[PDB]
């Protein structure tokens, strides 16, 4: 799960968004864990991604937890879906 390329894409997204919002310079390394949760009980159907990723903070490798929200559930739509980084923090 955590090494799929769509997960890597969302992980990079989370890191990029975190860097813009906080004026930071974390550098993405790898995803260590990823839970994908599709919510079928509401409209619009949305997916929450809970990513545990590794990123370099000035040469030090650290662990971060990110929540990425996506307005969609089809993988084929994921590239163009609206997305939001809703939480980014050290684990």
């Amino acid at each position: 799960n955590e090494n799929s390329l769509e997960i890597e894409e969302l992980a990079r997204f989370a890191v990029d968004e975190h860097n813009k919002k906080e004026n930071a310079l974390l550098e993405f390394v790898r995803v260590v864990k990823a839970k994908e949760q599709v919510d079928l009980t509401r409209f619009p159907v949305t997916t929450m991604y809970y990513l545990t990723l590794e990123a370099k903070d000035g040469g030090k490798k650290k662990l971060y937890e990110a929540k990425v929200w996506v307005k969609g559930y089809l993988l084929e739509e994921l590239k163009h879906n609206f997305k939001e980084l809703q939480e980014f923090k050290p684990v």
Binding site: K35, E36, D39, L40, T41, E76
Partner: protein, 75 residues
């Protein structure tokens, strides 16, 4: 409170979690899993506790609990 979270675990080691209503027929879940993954439905089989799942079965009827797992594999 009529909501339940189910893990759908595939033979490829992937896991996708779904929030569904407990009295919704599980066909909705099964169709969503296939569409999401790009899978054809004719191929694959869903199992819960080693047994097959009717399209009309609901989580309540199967006495499913929050965080239970549905196994999916192809024929």
């Amino acid at each position: 409170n009529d909501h339940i979270n189910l893990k759908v675990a595939g033979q490829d080691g992937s896991v996708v979690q779904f929030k569904i209503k407990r009295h919704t027929p599980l066909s909705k879940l099964m169709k969503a899993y296939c569409e999401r993954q790009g899978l054809s439905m004719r191929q694959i089989r869903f199992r819960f506790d080693g047994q097959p799942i009717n399209e009309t079965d609901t989580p309540a009827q199967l006495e499913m609990e929050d965080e239970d797992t549905i196994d999916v594999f192809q024929q």
